[PDB]
């Protein structure tokens with residue numbers, strides 16, 4: 527009961543791929559018979575073909591397939607790729623906005639942590655400069671470092687924990703503790719903002735209140751949504767009319 | 774009666790030290806960059822009347838951005854500190870007044886009390902001339918000028934008594 531593998535007419539797409547890698551296994555470099563390439567297996571992560579020793583049909587979710595659709599289903603990966611994906615599981619390597627910004631509107635549970643992470647990055651900057659909120663800074667590190675210092679970097683762990691719907695909860699717990707410290711600690715209220723447009727000194731806005739206000743992200747000045755969206759930011763109109771009359 | 778005073782000026786000119794010297798008659802030469810705005814309180818008395826100053830020093834380095842400045846509101850007096858030995862910080866004086874009038878926003882901003890402190894007169898590489906800085910303050914609606922040393926307690930008590938006096942005046946008006 528021998529298998530039939532020799533083929534004068536292999537599949538033309540595979541012949542193109544195997545030949546692109548000089549008929550060499552991508553993992554061990556073994557040079558393979560061009561008439562036998564049906565034996566090789568495609569590693570859905572590295573995008574290359576492998577001999578049946580280097581690739582043994584291990585299954586694994588695929589980074590690109592998680593960042594283009596919300597697709598966590600496992601795919602056949604080479605041994606080298608299963609090993610390496612497992613290694614970088616908790617590494618903050620994947621920048622959702624830089625890779626695919628559209629995913630933020632297809633996944634709600636992901637937009638929720640994006641939003642939760644935007645608040646946490648503003649709360650962190652304030653707690654770094656408020657000497658009374660230093661046990662709240664320690665609670666900010668019960669979660670990975672990068673969730674509260676960057677906004678668009680995820681690891682495979684975070685992407686999965688988001689789909690399992692648990693990453694929002696651990697982050698919502700933190701954007702509340704922080705929101706009540708700022709309501710009650712007026713060393714943080716002192717670093718709040720007054721909208722340069724309307725000047726209403728009765729409504730001190732903070733950058734993490736994204737319901738109320740939109741933050742410039744050149745000046746990081748904070749304005750009401752109502753007052754901004756149209757036109758430019760007044761802060762930079764002066765700051766670069768400053769060097770303007772200096773030069 | 775409670776006065777709010779706000780200390781501005783470039784990093785390392787002596788804001789935290791002038792305020793430590795005034796409130797606590799203390800001075801340490803070890804530099805510790807202030808990262809966030811905070812305050813001290815001194816009680817003084819003017820004319821049988823008890824009054825309490827709340828003096829805010831700022832982060833003159835570059836821990837501004839993303840962080841607001843709502844605490845300027847209700848400022849009864851604003852203090853501008855430059856270094857007499859670093860002539861650039863005397864140059865950025867205009868920049869600090871102009872921005873403060875825009876963030877605190879008082880009625881009649883050009884009759885608003887400013888007090889200018891030329892710090893570090895105890896050192897010997899003094900660059901900015903006294904008659905030059907006296908003139909600049911005469912330009913801006915006649916605002917007081919003090920050459921001070923947090924190190925040697927030179928004109929510190931003088932300056933913060935003028936700040937108290939001028940704040941006290943300012944506070945009793947926007948109640949009118």
Ligand SMILES: Nc1nc2c(ncn2[C@@H]2O[C@H](COP(=O)(O)OP(=O)(O)OP(=O)(O)O)[C@@H](O)[C@H]2O)c(=O)[nH]1
Pocket residue numbers: 783784785786787788789790791801802803804805806807830831832833834892893894895896921922923924925
């Ligand atoms: N000789 C002399 N040294 C001074 C005087 N005032 C301050 N210094 C020193 O200059 C350095 C900087 O002054 P600081 O008050 O600490 O800094 P600052 O102005 O608050 O600047 P930031 O805290 O960054 O906003 C410190 O080492 C002071 O000890 C002074 O009047 N005479």
Ligand SMILES: [Mg+2]
Pocket residue numbers: 788789805806807830831832833
């Ligand atoms: Mg300071």
Ligand SMILES: [Zn+2]
Pocket residue numbers: 551552553554555556576577578579580581
């Ligand atoms: Zn191989």
Ligand SMILES: [Zn+2]
Pocket residue numbers: 656657658659707708711712713714
């Ligand atoms: Zn605080």
Ligand SMILES: [Zn+2]
Pocket residue numbers: 721722723724725726749750753
């Ligand atoms: Zn507004």
Ligand SMILES: [Zn+2]
Pocket residue numbers: 742743744745746747758759760761762
């Ligand atoms: Zn802007």
